[PDB]
Design a protein around this ligand. Structure first.
Ligand SMILES: *[C@@H]1O[C@H](CO)[C@@H](O[C@@H]2O[C@H](CO)[C@@H](O[C@@H]3O[C@H](CO[C@H]4O[C@H](CO[C@H]5O[C@H](CO)[C@@H](O)[C@H](O)[C@@H]5O[C@H]5O[C@H](CO)[C@@H](O)[C@H](O)[C@@H]5O)[C@@H](O)[C@H](O[C@H]5O[C@H](CO)[C@@H](O)[C@H](O)[C@@H]5O)[C@@H]4O)[C@@H](O)[C@H](O[C@H]4O[C@H](CO)[C@@H](O)[C@H](O)[C@@H]4O)[C@@H]3O)[C@H](O)[C@H]2NC(C)=O)[C@H](O)[C@H]1NC(C)=O
Ligand SMILES: *[C@@H]1O[C@H](CO)[C@@H](O[C@@H]2O[C@H](CO)[C@@H](O[C@@H]3O[C@H](CO[C@H]4O[C@H](CO[C@H]5O[C@H](CO)[C@@H](O)[C@H](O)[C@@H]5O[C@H]5O[C@H](CO)[C@@H](O)[C@H](O)[C@@H]5O)[C@@H](O)[C@H](O)[C@@H]4O)[C@@H](O)[C@H](O)[C@@H]3O)[C@H](O)[C@H]2NC(C)=O)[C@H](O)[C@H]1NC(C)=O
Ligand SMILES: *[C@@H]1O[C@H](CO)[C@@H](O[C@@H]2O[C@H](CO)[C@@H](O)[C@H](O)[C@H]2NC(C)=O)[C@H](O)[C@H]1NC(C)=O
Ligand SMILES: *[C@@H]1O[C@H](CO)[C@@H](O[C@@H]2O[C@H](CO)[C@@H](O)[C@H](O)[C@H]2NC(C)=O)[C@H](O)[C@H]1NC(C)=O
Ligand SMILES: CCCCCC
Ligand SMILES: CCCCCC
Ligand SMILES: CCCCCC
Ligand SMILES: CCCCCC
Ligand SMILES: CCCCCC
Ligand SMILES: [Ca+2]
Ligand SMILES: [Ca+2]
Ligand SMILES: [Ca+2]
Ligand SMILES: [Ca+2]
Ligand SMILES: [Mn+2]
Ligand SMILES: [Mn+2]
Ligand SMILES: [Mn+2]
Ligand SMILES: [Mn+2]
Lengths: 230, 233, 233, 228
């Protein structure tokens, strides 16, 4: 029963995605999670999500097996002139068929949750966030089990790698800016069996801010995923 | 680029589109055609099953064509005092394609004058005199149940068959091989296929099978494992 | 579990052990056998070439046996008014083994009473009356030039042949296939081989080829590309 | 010209061992010397390379490899000692011999060498003060470092990647036991520093002075390269 799935997209197409809320694929093959107006500028209170169109098996109830996975992606978050960024984007494992949740600081993921995410959090929410912008590991809550500071760079491609090792239960997320040569990493244990259903949708969720001048694009340029169910 | 790879040692309904009689058993076998509650195959059965996300086979903007490889183990079992019919096939079909004719048309083709935009590799257990060669055969099927090429296949009742199908977009060569690990026998067929001119840009990949329409011509059409990989140049 | 994988679209001497007449050309072809000053293959030529790191095929502590898959493109060219001889083989051999007999023994086996501890897949272009089947063939060779199993091979002069060899350690099935993309012809042979009982734990993987010993029986033995993968379960 | 390997246990048969390096009966790559009590010894120097060279770039085509390596290491310091000197993953010229002991990690003394060091001993002439992960381009004086909170005797998991399209080299380390993680990244022009073909592997040294010593054990190693 040793199952695997791997995919690699250097360009996106709608045909193998479930798009929700504001998410679209551009004619240039970019996954734009949040809404652009007719002038190509990001709008307020935007919420988009996008998932690979086939569910991934994360664990097996008969055998007690848990999947290991790795994903990499390139994102571009651009803030217009005279604006600050909000709210961020996340890679997520969510229940099959789940619909977007609350927007703004809850990143379309949160509002019995069964969601694990890695957030790239561009806006301080004083009720649960650390002060600086951060990479967070989110287990059924917007209040991360662990964060690491992230020195956000406006409009420059970020390259992410997230891995999950089912033998150590360690989830590790890293981001590098090839242009700035800066890099960030966070790691914590997450018991996927105890939090997620057996099958999940994998993909992304992103929101723009709810108030004028708190806004950003949330673009994915490339995405690779691989899972192995031991 | 748009690459995809999967490996199923056990099947689950969650990542398949099942059509007609196809089911996944509680043991994780993909049973393409109908079994009664005693595990005996029924007449005039038709099932298909596809991976639930479409595969990009070629790109009209760039002219790129995918290369792919698939392997699978199948088990065709014929009840005592029957011969086998009709066979099973691995296929690339248009997204949202519905099953076609039963019996000798393997749920992939019909007697219509419309092109199926379907490429398949058939494991054909029943002679249809209007298009088949006389012996049981592996065929390469391009928009027709009349294979562009076949090779004889010495069918073995109820024994696991291991298949490998490869498509090289640089030579346009499609190659299908089958081995019976129990009998140590092997078969192979090869032909060129221009995927761009026959398939749409995106396809569903999976299987189609039919049982015979007449008493004493019947078989199971079980898949035990399936691996697929595609790479769009 | 341990693995090794490599893929060469062009050869370089830096990652090969070359023996006898084997050379790598400035165009990146692995030429196993020699050319005379007239640009024709010479008589009694013998070359071998191995990946320069040994592969672990099995483990005596764990009882694990490797599964492997290899693919390669070869070009055998015969001068006008000649027939081909003797052939080329993919082989697993003991680490540090030296070339064996010329001609019909393909540089892999000799007339000694010692076990060569060698498994090969031969592409045999010359009938040897003491042990061969009548037609040219793909053979599976276990410690002897007298193949445990062969399949006829319709040799085509000077056309690229594409080979795939797989070994599944769970069924012990070794399968070899050849296709000519130009002719769309294909051949396959399969048999079980217990690698633990024949090979040492570590082997060198690569090729062996010979040209004929008598005028008018001669060929080139060129490798154009080679991919290998092993997985020690 | 692509190459991939994965060793969950080591064997001598596919390695070039230099100086003190050995493979144990348990299949661990021990880069530095152990005494009869299984304790690490002073002034040890060991290297170990995959026994086939890797093609890193091609002068005819201008192609540069992308690569990725992962490995688990165990650095153990005896009681009443501190650690020295560290271990490194390196790309070195084919047939390269070990260089200087101690703080030079067996790699330096233009040695046409690129390395990622896990540096357990402050050398005031070139190091930053805290233990660190460094990117080393032809010098023991890293082009870039990041602090590393060394944990005595706990398994460390490393990932190093090199993307030839961005020229970005990234190294990361995690302690699964402590849930701590570290990362450093810089651009490296491999064409201008390495030969076309290299040996890939490890170099490690134990300290030269009493009470500065460590084991330098590799437990698993995966490597993959792709010459575009
Ligand atoms: C392919 O993969 C699939 C999917 O993974 C495999 O299918 C699974 O197989 C396992 C093992 O056989 C099944 O486990 C068994 O489940 C039953 C309970 O079944 C009923 O409840 C299911 C759960 O419902 C809750 O959770 C879901 C989300 O996870 C939620 O949507 C529901 O609304 C519900 O929520 C409620 O409960 C929660 C806590 O439990 C609360 O928080 C929440 O707020 C609510 O109160 C449900 O999915 C299931 O429905 C499926 O199956 C029915 C048929 O029964 C079908 O009609 C439906 O369409 C669904 O498909 C049911 O309603 C449980 O009783 C079993 O327990 C026995 O075994 C355990 C294990 O040892 C023992 O501890 C027990 O004592 C007992 O003896 C068992 O756990 C699982 O139900 C099933 N899931 C699905 C989605 O089908 C499939 O087998 C794979 N195929 C192959 C070939 O391998
Ligand atoms: C990586 O993978 C590799 C390859 O698979 C593994 O390596 C292989 O490991 C196996 C298992 O250890 C080795 O084979 C064994 O080697 C044993 C030693 O072989 C040598 O020594 C033998 C004995 O030598 C003594 O006796 C002879 C007389 O018979 C004298 O001539 C000689 O001088 C010695 O005499 C002295 O000691 C004896 C002690 O018995 C006294 O009696 C005398 O008084 C005197 O003092 C010798 O016979 C033999 O020919 C060798 O020289 C051997 O015992 C055993 O049976 C077995 O063969 C492989 O050698 C090794 N292979 C390679 C390629 O190196 C490795 O394990 C793996 N590593 C991991 C981590 O898994
Ligand atoms: C993704 O692929 C789809 C399908 O090939 C493309 O959508 C088709 O585009 C053609 C060309 O304009 C239309 O005539 C079809 O009707 C489209 N089909 C659908 C379902 O709308 C699409 O262009 C590709 N997307 C990107 C971003 O490349
Ligand atoms: C195999 O690789 C070797 C080592 O790079 C190539 O030889 C070198 O080629 C470069 C560029 O052509 C020269 O700058 C070096 O001086 C060569 N060194 C030698 C010949 O030792 C060699 O050409 C490659 N072989 C093939 C068949 O491509
Ligand atoms: C380290 C995570 C495993 C990646 C393969 C699914
Ligand atoms: C994804 C594999 C390509 C097919 C040619 C052997
Ligand atoms: C190493 C992969 C080979 C498996 C044999 C089919
Ligand atoms: C399907 C390709 C086989 C050659 C080695 C991966
Ligand atoms: C061979 C894979 C390279 C990946 C480096 C980012
Ligand atoms: Ca926030
Ligand atoms: Ca028929
Ligand atoms: Ca012969
Ligand atoms: Ca130092
Ligand atoms: Mn946050
Ligand atoms: Mn037919
Ligand atoms: Mn022969
Ligand atoms: Mn240092």
């Amino acid at each position: 029963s040793a199952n695997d799935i791997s995919f690699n997209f250097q360009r996106f197409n709608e045909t193998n995605l479930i798009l929700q809320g504001d998410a679209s694929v551009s004619s240039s093959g970019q996954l734009r999670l949040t809404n652009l107006n007719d002038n190509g500028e990001p709008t307020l209170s935007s919420l988009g999500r996008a998932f690979y169109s086939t569910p991934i098996q994360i664990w097996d109830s008969t055998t007690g097996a848990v999947a290991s996975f790795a994903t990499s992606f390139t994102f571009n978050i651009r803030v217009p002139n005279n604006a600050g960024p909000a709210d961020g984007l996340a890679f997520a494992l969510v229940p099959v068929g789940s619909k977007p949740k609350d927007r703004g600081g809850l990143l379309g993921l949160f509002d019995k949750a069964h969601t694990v995410a890695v957030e790239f959090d561009t806006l301080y929410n004083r009720d649960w966030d650390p002060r600086e912008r951060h990479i967070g590991i989110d287990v059924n809550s917007i209040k991360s089990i662990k964060t690491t500071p992230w020195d956000f760079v406006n409009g420059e491609d970020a390259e992410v790698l997230i891995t999950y090792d089912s033998s150590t239960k360690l989830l590790v997320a890293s981001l590098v800016y090839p242009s700035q040569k800066t890099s960030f990493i966070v790691s914590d244990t997450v018991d996927l069996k105890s939090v997620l259903p057996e099958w999940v949708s994998v993909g992304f969720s992103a929101t723009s801010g709810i108030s004028k001048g708190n806004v950003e694009t949330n673009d994915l340029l490339s995405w690779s995923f691989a899972s192995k169910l031991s």
